[PDB]
Structures are given as C-alpha cells and as structure tokens.
C-alpha cells in the first residue's frame, strides 16, 4: 500500500495505517473465533476482548486530523466497518467500541468513494435498525447516514 514515489515520511504514515489495519483485522478475527468457540463449546467463561484491548490505539490514530488523508487513502474504514459488524451470534461489539468509532467518523471527511470501498455505509444503516443499539448511538448513526446521503 505504500507509494514508491513518495518520500520516507509518506511511506512511514502509510505503513503506520496499514499496520493498524492488519492489527484491527487480526483482533476482530480472534474475537470472532472466540465467539464461535464459545458456541461450538458452550464454555460461558469465553469473552472477546481483543478489539477492546486495541481500541485506544485505534482511537488515537482516528482522532489525528493530520492522519485523515492517510486513513482514507488506505481504506482503514474497511477495518472500522468490520469492528462494527454484528458477531456470529447477532451480538454487537461493546458500547465503548461503538461510541468511540462513531465519534471518530463524525470528525472524518468521509466521501462516497471511501464508503464504497469500505462498505461502511451498510453497517451504519444496520445501527439505525438494531434493537440492541443505545438510542444516543442510533441518533449518531442516523446523523451520519444523513451527512452521507446528501443529493
């Protein structure tokens, strides 16, 4: 994902975001494995905490305005979409994850092309229908859908 004809700094930022994208994907996949393992085996002690563990790192990157271009250009939002998706048993990620991700989306200059490559629009719509979503986060989702379906 790094651009060969960019200088070291630009490659360094692309790498930072590409590393984060992979770490987010590993964390989501490990939590999914845990929740399938929790189903196949009915072991009730099993909880999915890899996304929650990595969240401060994700929030720190998402909240830096000077990283917006790099975030958007490298499709990090695809990993955000994956973090918001219901899990195999229909359960949502933790409130802290939902709130932190939506608040960060509110500040990013997301364009149609980014929504297209990430699939982020589709998961945000789900948050406006779900019964398990807190009412304040459903309002935030609706407000994002509205900022993204302007004519």
């Amino acid at each position: 994902g790094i651009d060969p004809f960019t200088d070291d700094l630009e490659q360094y930022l692309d790498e930072k975001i590409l590393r984060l994208k992979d770490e987010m994907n590993i964390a989501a996949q490990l939590d999914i494995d845990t929740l399938n393992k929790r189903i196949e085996t009915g072991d009730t002690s099993l909880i999915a905490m890899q996304k929650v563990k990595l969240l401060p790192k994700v929030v720190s990157v998402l909240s830096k305005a000077n990283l917006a271009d790099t975030i958007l250009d490298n499709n990090l939002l695809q990993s955000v979409r994956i973090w918001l998706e219901p899990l195999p048993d229909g359960s949502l990620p933790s409130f802290e994850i939902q709130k932190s991700l939506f608040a960060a989306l509110n500040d990013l200059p997301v364009k149609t092309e980014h929504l297209k490559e990430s699939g982020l629009g589709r998961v945000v719509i789900f948050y406006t229908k779900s019964k398990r979503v807190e009412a304040q986060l459903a309002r935030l989702a609706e407000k994002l859908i509205a900022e993204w379906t302007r004519p």
């Binding site: 048993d89 589709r122 998961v123 779900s130």
Partner: peptide, 29 residues
C-alpha cells in the same frame, strides 16, 4: 441539478439493497 437524478443510483452504490444484516436483526427478534 443536471445529473441530480443519478444521486439515487449513487445511494445504491453506497448502501446496496439493505439486507446484508437481516440475519442478525432476525436473531434479535
């Protein structure tokens, strides 16, 4: 306004048909 009709199609490009997650919505119910 010239292509404002096309904006519908663009919604569709972003959102699809809306049913990707019906399985999860049905679980809740």
């Amino acid at each position: 306004f010239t292509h404002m009709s096309d904006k519908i199609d663009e919604m569709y490009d972003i959102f699809g048909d809306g049913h990707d997650y019906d399985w999860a919505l049905e679980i809740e119910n």
